[PDB]
Amino acid sequence: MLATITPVLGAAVIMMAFDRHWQTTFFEYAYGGDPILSQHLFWFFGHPEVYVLIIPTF
Amino acid sequence: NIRAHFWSNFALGLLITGPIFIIPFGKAFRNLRSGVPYYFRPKYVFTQKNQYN
Amino acid sequence: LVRLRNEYSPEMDYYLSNFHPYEMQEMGESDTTVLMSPYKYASHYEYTQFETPSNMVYSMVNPDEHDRLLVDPAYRMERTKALEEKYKVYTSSLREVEKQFEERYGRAGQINISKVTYSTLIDVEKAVLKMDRLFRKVAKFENRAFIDRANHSRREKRMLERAQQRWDSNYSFFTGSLTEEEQKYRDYYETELEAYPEDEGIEQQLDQQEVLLSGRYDPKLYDFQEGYTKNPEDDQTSLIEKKAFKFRYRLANETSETFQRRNNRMVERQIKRFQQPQYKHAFEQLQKNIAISSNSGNALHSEYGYLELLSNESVQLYKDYYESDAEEDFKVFENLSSKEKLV
Amino acid sequence: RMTNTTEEAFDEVSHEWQALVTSNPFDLNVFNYLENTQTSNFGTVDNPL
Amino acid sequence: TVINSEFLTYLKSNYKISFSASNIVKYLSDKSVNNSVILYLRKNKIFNKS
Amino acid sequence: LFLINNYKAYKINTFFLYIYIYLNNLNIIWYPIFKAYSIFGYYKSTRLNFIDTKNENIKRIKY
Amino acid sequence: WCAYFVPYNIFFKTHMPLEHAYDNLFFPYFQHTHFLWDNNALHIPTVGGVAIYATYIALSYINNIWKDYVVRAQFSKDKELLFVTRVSPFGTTEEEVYEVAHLEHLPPSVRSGVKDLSAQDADGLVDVTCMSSQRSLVFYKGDQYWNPKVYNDFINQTSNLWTRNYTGYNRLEVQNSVEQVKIGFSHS
Amino acid sequence: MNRFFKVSSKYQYYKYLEQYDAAFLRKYQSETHWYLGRRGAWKNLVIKYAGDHISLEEEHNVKYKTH
Amino acid sequence: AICLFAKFWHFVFIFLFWVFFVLRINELGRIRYPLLVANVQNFIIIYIM
Amino acid sequence: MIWKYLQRTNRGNIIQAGLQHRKFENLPFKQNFDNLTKAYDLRMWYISNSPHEAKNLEYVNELEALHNELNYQNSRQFLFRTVSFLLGWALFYQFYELPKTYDWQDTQEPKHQVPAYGDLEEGGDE
Amino acid sequence: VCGIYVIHVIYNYMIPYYWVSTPLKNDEFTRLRMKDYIASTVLEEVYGISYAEWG
Amino acid sequence: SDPNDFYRDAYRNENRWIDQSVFTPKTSKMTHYDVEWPKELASRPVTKK
Amino acid sequence: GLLLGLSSIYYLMYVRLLPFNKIIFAWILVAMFLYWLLSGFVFFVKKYQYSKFTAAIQRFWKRTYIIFWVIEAGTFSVFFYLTLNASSEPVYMYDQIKIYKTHLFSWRWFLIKLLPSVSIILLGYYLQLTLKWNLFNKQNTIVLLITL
Amino acid sequence: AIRNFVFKISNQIQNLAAKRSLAYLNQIDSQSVPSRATINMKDQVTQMQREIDNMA
Numbered sequence A: 001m002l003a004t005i006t007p008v009l010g011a012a013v014i015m016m017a018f019d020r021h022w023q024t025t026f027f028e029y030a031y032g033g034d035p036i037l038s039q040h041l042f043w044f045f046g047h048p049e050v051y052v053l054i055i056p057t058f
Numbered sequence B: 001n002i003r004a005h006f007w008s009n010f011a012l013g014l015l016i017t018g019p020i021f022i023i024p025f026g027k028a029f030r031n032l033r034s035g036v037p038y039y040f041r042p043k044y045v046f047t048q049k050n051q052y053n
Numbered sequence C: 001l002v003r004l005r006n007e008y009s010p011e012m013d014y015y016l017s018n019f020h021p022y023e024m025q026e027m028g029e030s031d032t033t034v035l036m037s038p039y040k041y042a043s044h045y046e047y048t049q050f051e052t053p054s055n056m057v058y059s060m061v062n063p064d065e066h067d068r069l070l071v072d073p074a075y076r077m078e079r080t081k082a083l084e085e086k087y088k089v090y091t092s093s094l095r096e097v098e099k100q101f102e103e104r105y106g107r108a109g110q111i112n113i114s115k116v117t118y119s120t121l122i123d124v125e126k127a128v129l130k131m132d133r134l135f136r137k138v139a140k141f142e143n144r145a146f147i148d149r150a151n152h153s154r155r156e157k158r159m160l161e162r163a164q165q166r167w168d169s170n171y172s173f174f175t176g177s178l179t180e181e182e183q184k185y186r187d188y189y190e191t192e193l194e195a196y197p198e199d200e201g202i203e204q205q206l207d208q209q210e211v212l213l214s215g216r217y218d219p220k221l222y223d224f225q226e227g228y229t230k231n232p233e234d235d236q237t238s239l240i241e242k243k244a245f246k247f248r249y250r251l252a253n254e255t256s257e258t259f260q261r262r263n264n265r266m267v268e269r270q271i272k273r274f275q276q277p278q279y280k281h282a283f284e285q286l287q288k289n290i291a292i293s294s295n296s297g298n299a300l301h302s303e304y305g306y307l308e309l310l311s312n313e314s315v316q317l318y319k320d321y322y323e324s325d326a327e328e329d330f331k332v333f334e335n336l337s338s339k340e341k342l343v
Numbered sequence D: 001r002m003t004n005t006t007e008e009a010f011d012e013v014s015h016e017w018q019a020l021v022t023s024n025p026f027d028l029n030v031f032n033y034l035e036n037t038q039t040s041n042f043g044t045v046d047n048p049l
Numbered sequence E: 001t002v003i004n005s006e007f008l009t010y011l012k013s014n015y016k017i018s019f020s021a022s023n024i025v026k027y028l029s030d031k032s033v034n035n036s037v038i039l040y041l042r043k044n045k046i047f048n049k050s
Numbered sequence F: 001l002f003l004i005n006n007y008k009a010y011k012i013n014t015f016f017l018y019i020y021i022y023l024n025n026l027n028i029i030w031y032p033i034f035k036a037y038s039i040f041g042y043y044k045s046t047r048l049n050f051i052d053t054k055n056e057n058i059k060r061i062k063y
Numbered sequence G: 001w002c003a004y005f006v007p008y009n010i011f012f013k014t015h016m017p018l019e020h021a022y023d024n025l026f027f028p029y030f031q032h033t034h035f036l037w038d039n040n041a042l043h044i045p046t047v048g049g050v051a052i053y054a055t056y057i058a059l060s061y062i063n064n065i066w067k068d069y070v071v072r073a074q075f076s077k078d079k080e081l082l083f084v085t086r087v088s089p090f091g092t093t094e095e096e097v098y099e100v101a102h103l104e105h106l107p108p109s110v111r112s113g114v115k116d117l118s119a120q121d122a123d124g125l126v127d128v129t130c131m132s133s134q135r136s137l138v139f140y141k142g143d144q145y146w147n148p149k150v151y152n153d154f155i156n157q158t159s160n161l162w163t164r165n166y167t168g169y170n171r172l173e174v175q176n177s178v179e180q181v182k183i184g185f186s187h188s
Numbered sequence H: 001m002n003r004f005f006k007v008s009s010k011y012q013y014y015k016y017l018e019q020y021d022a023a024f025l026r027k028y029q030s031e032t033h034w035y036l037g038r039r040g041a042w043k044n045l046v047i048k049y050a051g052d053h054i055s056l057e058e059e060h061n062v063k064y065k066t067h
Numbered sequence I: 001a002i003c004l005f006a007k008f009w010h011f012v013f014i015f016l017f018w019v020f021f022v023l024r025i026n027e028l029g030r031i032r033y034p035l036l037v038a039n040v041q042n043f044i045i046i047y048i049m
Numbered sequence J: 001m002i003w004k005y006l007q008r009t010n011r012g013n014i015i016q017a018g019l020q021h022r023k024f025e026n027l028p029f030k031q032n033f034d035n036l037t038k039a040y041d042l043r044m045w046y047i048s049n050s051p052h053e054a055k056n057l058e059y060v061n062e063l064e065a066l067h068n069e070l071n072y073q074n075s076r077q078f079l080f081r082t083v084s085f086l087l088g089w090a091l092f093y094q095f096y097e098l099p100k101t102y103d104w105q106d107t108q109e110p111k112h113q114v115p116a117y118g119d120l121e122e123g124g125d126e
Numbered sequence K: 001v002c003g004i005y006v007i008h009v010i011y012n013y014m015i016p017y018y019w020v021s022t023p024l025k026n027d028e029f030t031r032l033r034m035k036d037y038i039a040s041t042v043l044e045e046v047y048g049i050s051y052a053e054w055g
Numbered sequence L: 001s002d003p004n005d006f007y008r009d010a011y012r013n014e015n016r017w018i019d020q021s022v023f024t025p026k027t028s029k030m031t032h033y034d035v036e037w038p039k040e041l042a043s044r045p046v047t048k049k
Numbered sequence M: 001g002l003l004l005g006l007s008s009i010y011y012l013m014y015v016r017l018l019p020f021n022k023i024i025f026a027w028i029l030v031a032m033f034l035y036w037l038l039s040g041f042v043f044f045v046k047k048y049q050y051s052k053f054t055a056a057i058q059r060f061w062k063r064t065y066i067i068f069w070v071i072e073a074g075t076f077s078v079f080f081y082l083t084l085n086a087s088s089e090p091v092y093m094y095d096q097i098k099i100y101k102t103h104l105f106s107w108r109w110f111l112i113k114l115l116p117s118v119s120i121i122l123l124g125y126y127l128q129l130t131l132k133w134n135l136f137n138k139q140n141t142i143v144l145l146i147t148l
Numbered sequence N: 001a002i003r004n005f006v007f008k009i010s011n012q013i014q015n016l017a018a019k020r021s022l023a024y025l026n027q028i029d030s031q032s033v034p035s036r037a038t039i040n041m042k043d044q045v046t047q048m049q050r051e052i053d054n055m056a
């Protein structure tokens, strides 16, 4: 599961860094950015992250 | 109606092309371009082909 | 728990069947790193552009002996020659044991093969021998300068002079399987060719004799069958076709001396028949209209008569060769069909 | 492609080549593939696994 | 190679062959044997069991 | 057939046949094997129809 | 030139991009600037190492390519050793010593490549291999670059392994190609 | 067969070539033993020992170790 | 632009791979199929990218 | 007589094909790719269809040698043809007038080049 | 069950989204409503009033 | 070479005791292996330390 | 090599007047990083030339190579999906020009740019094929051509 | 050079034509295929003439 999900989180975090520093406006609604795209990308990994945390406990 | 016509034409085309093109086309596998009779050339599995031809 | 020991003993050999054979496909050095094919990522090993030699023989050596072999090339050559001699001895002993076993017991059975496959195998053997001879000649021509340096100057001068004489003021018209390169090779190696001409036709006849006398194509060892049939069925060819096959592959079933005797008898009878007046007239008529026949692909009566005489001569040759055979009825040769005559 | 044994075979690779060319049980067991081991019978006193 | 007739007769008299040779080397001809190449394997104590 | 045989001898007629033969000679291809088993493996694979005729497969009970 | 002069002028002496920089891109036209990128100066080790290793590799491979060719060859007194002069990295002379016994002219592994050898031509090159050092000596076939009284002995001594049997055996010499082995003649 | 004719060297050890066929020498010193033919191969043993020993695990080049 | 940055980093990686390979073969004195084919496949992958 | 042409199959369509004797009657005096591949195919077919093991093994060795020779010939052919193709490509693009008059609209984004929202991007009235 | 639900969601919401991507000269509103009806009228958020007495 | 005919006589339940008994077959002794090798093997030097 | 590299490094430092202490500290860290990363591979190459490079080791190295390239391919594929599904403003009024922005590049220009890579891969294949019957010195020409 | 190549082409063409026209006289070809073909052609001609005679 981690192998499946990690690249999505990596891409989302890299895009966040680019928006912060280079001002790529990936998540700026003014000129085409999608703020909800960041949430989608993060949670797509976030829920599998908690599932990964819990599954070994069983 | 178009489906009926198309499938009738497809069956007729199979019947016509059987002896006209594909069977003569099969004569090209009698020998290799070097003149030797056809023999098996495996890719990854050396299948046994003891059966004739 | 079986604690295997690093030794060669019957106790260890007792467990040979309890192991999978070691895979060779993953051994050696691979010229392909990894296959980028999701369809067979775990079904196919990496392919190889080159081939895998199979003429390798391995022998175990001690550490000090291996160090000696590495350090001393002379000792390495000596041990290698000794090992080759011992391998030859071992192979000869195995062959003799196999021959003794065959003599004592007998072959397991007859080989089910088609007559077409048999003929094609013989033809392929002849073609392989011819190609080997051609390759030997070409390699000799290519390596003449490096193998014979003392006479290279004179031989090259002679070859160049002859080639210039041929292609300076004249065209060279080649008949048969003769080419300018082959003529140059013959001119260069004139000396050696005198001792052993190695003529194409004579070599082909001798190699056919060798192939048929090797004994591998003896009809006694084969059960001829159609092959293409769903069920195993005997050969369905006509009686005339069977007789023609037997005559064509006479050498396969006959021994050297018996074949020599029968062939000498047949050739003497054929020579006498040709010396008979009718054949001389037929050949004279054949030669009379050679120029006319060259203007068209159609034949003339003087040639049709010659061909009919050829058919009769073939029938008589078969009869003469198989004269001393009780289980032979020659009446079948009387009033043959057109297809039988062609066969 | 086949390695020159007399020149480069030493220790581990030499033992692997020995297993390949002789199939002696010791070497074959040492270099047996981990993915698959030959299936055997069911262990018994008369015919133990 | 050539084997002396007396030696071969002595071998036949002393031992009677009743089993076939299993090694594929029995099929090798002289040409193949000559074309064969000899290689050496270094055999020593084995310490790695993997 | 008679007309074809009559025109066979003409050199102009045979020029096209010569060109066709030349193209056929230039149209040769090779088909190598690209597996580690290679020629020896293929040869052993093609031995199914002939293994039964070998001496080692003859019935010979040890006892 | 190609690696330093043109890149330097294109990178530092002008802020205007070249056509190959952006013809495949879809940005509006803009200029460059060397002082508003890579604040960490991470490109300094990259450029330095690339330059150093590229120069080293180029020079070393030039030397390797030129090593095979032989400039001068001299037999020692008694003709036991051969002193060979070869090209150095800067085109000067470098000395080496070889043994005539080790020196040998070997045929190619592939027997169909004999016709492709440069030695086939009258003014080609001869590839003599040192079987001890696994080195190759290249000599011009032209008679100009040869001493005409020590050439026959040299070629005879260095061309022993290129024999007639390299081309194969006919049916007259197939039997003699190997030495027959006698078994059991000395004892039963 | 084409046996090696003679060795014009004062070193009697080199005369071993005279006892072998040219084809044998090509097979075992030129085709597949080219890197091993008529060579000491002591460097092979030295490199084997260097590789198999437990020496310092800091390598700079194939020839030298890190300073 | 981000994809092209990734492509450039991959190309730098394969360039370093090739530099390492050439230096090692120069030191050894001969080329080897494993590393040579690895470099060839790296070139193919970079061409694809 | 339609059956005589439909249900009747030619003898060659069923029986094994023979050896083309014209392919071997006359051959050049050069040990070239054509002759090498002809010999390779002959030996391969003989190994496939032969019951004689003694002849096959020597044929196996000769076939390995022929495989090496054909690999060398193919390497030469590949080198020559690839070099010719690359040189032809380079010369074609050197002597070919590449069109440089394609539409450049894609490179222009007037709204993005000159922000049309102005100060409203940083925030509205209050 | 999840796959069938996802297939239905795709058929209703994903593929139809690409049918119209530019202004349409003729019957633009009609086509937009045609593509929107299948997605906005799914029974999941429509059915239930028939048994409203349950709650 | 009939497989069933061979097997029915080769493998039997009443011969189990002698079918799986390991032994050294009677073969002519070889000096290099059965005479010389044991002598050199037993003549190896022995060191206390 | 040393002359050119040192000159380039000093010029690039001087043009922007980097702080020496901080930059030298960073470059020391980077040097140690890269040096040890490459020294691991140097050790692997030096150790596997005798008695260590077995079939299992070769398969392991092939697997590592494919795994690395697979991870890189996965990351690049995620980025490629993001590129393909890049968001944009509504086409009706906000951005009406999006319809005519196809961003199509000329193949007549792409092929010439693509030529060098195919040249390199073909040269590499030729070197691989020719390694069976050629020496190191003779193939240095192909190696140098590929390097250039 | 050019003249030699042209003559070689002409020689090969002439040899091919001579073979096609007179291969039925000798046994160079295995199985005497051209000879059998010529014999079959004569047989067919004679059979056609005899068929006309028998119809009459």
Ligand SMILES: CCCCCCCCCCCCCCCCCC(=O)OC[C@H](COP(=O)([O-])OCC(O)COP(=O)([O-])OC[C@@H](COC(=O)CCCCCCCCCCCCCCCCC)OC(=O)CCCCCCCCCCCCCCCCC)OC(=O)CCCCCCCCCCCCCCCCC
Pocket: B042, B043, B044, B045, C038, C039, C040, C043, C044
């Ligand atoms: C409903 C449609 C839905 C999808 C939409 C439509 C399709 C869209 C396009 C799909 C394809 C992508 C486009 C490029 C295709 C290129 C094909 C090619 O060049 O290779 C053909 C290649 C055949 O060439 P070949 O190897 O030379 O031929 C055999 C030789 O004799 C080799 O000889 P040998 O000696 O080396 O080996 C001998 C032996 C071994 O050789 C092999 O073939 C090797 C083993 C092959 C195993 C294949 C299955 C395992 C796949 C592994 C993973 C693949 C990727 C998975 C990705 C998703 C992971 C989650 O031969 C065989 O066994 C041959 C069998 C091949 C038959 C294939 C027939 C079609 C499939 C049905 C198979 C049924 C089997 C029999 C049962 C019959 C029914 C009861 O492979 C096939 O034809 C089979 C491929 C099967 C896997 C397909 C995976 C597709 C992945 C992309 C999906 C895209 C998205 C789809 C929608 C979903 C979005 C989320």
Ligand SMILES: CCCCCCCCCCCCCCCCCC(=O)OC[C@H](COP(=O)([O-])OCC(O)COP(=O)([O-])OC[C@@H](COC(=O)CCCCCCCCCCCCCCCCC)OC(=O)CCCCCCCCCCCCCCCCC)OC(=O)CCCCCCCCCCCCCCCCC
Pocket: A004, C034, C035, C036, C037, C038, C039, C040, I044, I047, I048, M073, M077
């Ligand atoms: C309309 C469709 C087509 C449009 C094409 C438009 C043009 C695009 C050109 C772009 C490339 C430029 C030219 C490059 C030349 C390269 C030459 C070369 O040496 O390459 C041949 C080289 C020969 O292979 P080899 O290892 O030497 O020998 C194999 C044997 O011969 C055994 O032979 P085999 O045939 O059985 O197997 C080999 C086969 C294997 O290839 C195929 O069967 C694929 C054929 C269709 C290619 C389509 C190109 C891309 C088109 C746009 C994207 C559409 C979706 C594609 C989805 C399917 C994957 C392609 O190769 C071929 O089919 C030969 C032609 C391949 C052309 C180059 C393909 C570039 C692929 C780029 C993407 C790679 C990463 C994708 C990851 C998955 C993303 C969803 O193979 C490749 O390089 C092809 C690699 C393909 C990898 C596909 C991976 C699929 C995913 C599987 C794992 C999924 C895990 C999921 C985990 C997470 C789940 C949540």
Ligand SMILES: CCCCCCCCCCCCCCCCCC(=O)OC[C@H](COP(=O)([O-])OCC(O)COP(=O)([O-])OC[C@@H](COC(=O)CCCCCCCCCCCCCCCCC)OC(=O)CCCCCCCCCCCCCCCCC)OC(=O)CCCCCCCCCCCCCCCCC
Pocket: F010, F011, F012, F013, F015
């Ligand atoms: C419009 C639709 C398409 C058709 C037209 C195409 C364009 C025009 C083509 C014109 C060709 C014919 C020119 C007149 C020839 C007159 C010959 C002569 O005096 O009679 C000797 C001969 C009499 O001698 P005889 O001792 O009684 O019997 C000897 C036998 O015939 C046994 O003799 P044989 O048959 O073995 O003779 C072979 C012949 C030749 O030997 C060969 O068979 C070897 C192959 C040689 C080349 C053959 C083709 C040459 C023409 C085409 C070239 C195409 C190049 C393309 C280049 C690339 C373009 C992108 O020997 C020679 O005559 C030696 C000549 C060697 C030099 C050749 C070069 C000549 C100069 C080049 C320019 C030619 C005119 C160009 C006009 C403009 C074209 C645009 O004539 C006969 O056999 C009976 C007929 C006599 C009256 C003929 C009246 C004229 C009508 C002739 C029609 C021939 C048609 C052939 C083709 C049929 C379809 C496949």
Ligand SMILES: CCCCCCCCCCCCCCCCCC(=O)OC[C@H](COP(=O)([O-])OCC(O)COP(=O)([O-])OC[C@@H](COC(=O)CCCCCCCCCCCCCCCCC)OC(=O)CCCCCCCCCCCCCCCCC)OC(=O)CCCCCCCCCCCCCCCCC
Pocket: G042, G044, G045, G046, G048, G049, G050, G052, G053, H060, H061, H063, H064, H065, H066, H067, I016, I019, I020, I023, I024, I026, I027, M002, M006, M009, M010, M027, M028, M029, M030, M031, M032, M033, M034, M035, M038, M039
């Ligand atoms: C302190 C930080 C660093 C400062 C460096 C300053 C610049 C120095 C340049 C020197 C260049 C080499 C000169 C060698 C001459 C001697 C050659 C010789 O005799 O051969 C022996 C041997 C080489 O043998 P060989 O047979 O000649 O080699 C031939 C091979 O084919 C050749 O193969 P190989 O030997 O090179 O093999 C080693 C292998 C192993 O790889 C390496 O060597 C790694 C190289 C890393 C370089 C990093 C440079 C960073 C600093 C840049 C400049 C700083 C400012 C400088 C000052 C201002 C400007 C003037 O190298 C590679 O293959 C590298 C591949 C290419 C990569 C290039 C660099 C990376 C580019 C891509 C990424 C760049 C962005 C960063 C990305 C990462 C971010 C985290 O050399 C050695 O063992 C080293 C030198 C001799 C021993 C040391 C003697 C002095 C004592 C040590 C003093 C310093 C340390 C202790 C200080 C404290 C004392 C108390």
Ligand SMILES: CCCCCCCCCCCCCCCCCC(=O)OC[C@H](COP(=O)([O-])OCC[N+](C)(C)C)OC(=O)CCCCCCCCCCCCCCCCC
Pocket: C035, C036, C037, C038, C041, C042, C043, C044, C045, C046, I045, I048, I049, M063, M066, M069, M070, M072, M073, M076, M077, M080
């Ligand atoms: C955009 C630019 C283009 C891209 C540029 C980069 C291109 C890189 C090309 C090279 C690398 C990729 C090559 C193709 C892939 C090769 C894979 C491979 O060989 O790996 C074998 C590796 C190693 O295999 P191995 O080591 O056993 O291989 C040896 C095999 N034998 C022994 C037979 C020789 O293992 C695998 O990864 C295979 C098993 C896993 C495969 C994936 C299964 C699915 C996992 C997820 C579960 C499902 C989730 C839901 C999916 C559906 C969602 C909708």
Ligand SMILES: CCCCCCCCCCCCCCCCCC(=O)OC[C@H](COP(=O)([O-])OCC[N+](C)(C)C)OC(=O)CCCCCCCCCCCCCCCCC
Pocket: A014, A021, A022, G003, G004, G007, G036, G037, G038, G039, G042, G043, G046, G047, G048, G050, G051, I002, I005, I006, I009, I010, I012, I013, M008, M072
């Ligand atoms: C790393 C390789 C192995 C692993 C493979 C996988 C790696 C994938 C990494 C990327 C993943 C996806 C995220 C992308 C992030 C991109 C970040 C980015 O763009 O930063 C770059 C940054 C730019 O960042 P920046 O902050 O300066 O950006 C400028 C923009 N503003 C002003 C808005 C901040 O640049 C560098 O890091 C410097 C790179 C220097 C390269 C030098 C190469 C020299 C070549 C020399 C040879 C050529 C000939 C000349 C020789 C002369 C010799 C004298």
Ligand SMILES: CCCCCCCCCCCCCCCCCC(=O)OC[C@H](COP(=O)([O-])OCC[N+](C)(C)C)OC(=O)CCCCCCCCCCCCCCCCC
Pocket: K001, K004, K005, K008, K037, K038, K041, K042, K043, K044
């Ligand atoms: C072998 C027995 C076969 C039995 C026949 C039924 C199964 C056939 C095969 C499976 C597909 C079933 C699809 C049913 C729905 C088709 C239409 C559709 O999607 O829209 C209606 C509805 C959607 O309705 P709607 O909201 O779009 O309404 C359309 C009308 N307006 C717009 C006016 C409101 O589909 C769903 O709601 C799908 C929900 C997901 C779960 C569906 C489960 C179906 C029943 C269980 C099937 C189990 C099969 C097991 C097979 C293996 C074991 C035997």
Ligand SMILES: CCCCCCCCCCCCCCCCCC(=O)OC[C@H](COP(=O)([O-])OCC[N+](C)(C)C)OC(=O)CCCCCCCCCCCCCCCCC
Pocket: C029, C033, I012, I013, I016, I017, I020, I032, I033, I034, I035, I036, I038, M034, M041, M042, M044, M045, M048, M049, M050, M053, M057, M058, M061, M062, M064, M065, M068
């Ligand atoms: C700013 C730019 C980027 C900065 C980052 C710097 C990146 C540097 C990358 C260097 C890569 C060097 C690779 C060398 C591989 C050597 C393999 C070896 O030991 O040989 C095995 C062997 C060597 O074989 P051989 O040919 O030498 O000999 C075998 C032995 N005989 C000949 C006797 C039989 O090779 C193989 O098995 C072939 C396949 C090799 C596959 C190698 C994969 C390497 C993967 C590296 C991943 C790196 C990740 C980096 C992450 C990011 C870092 C910042």
Ligand SMILES: [Cu+2]
Pocket: A046, A047, A048, A050
């Ligand atoms: Cu959740």
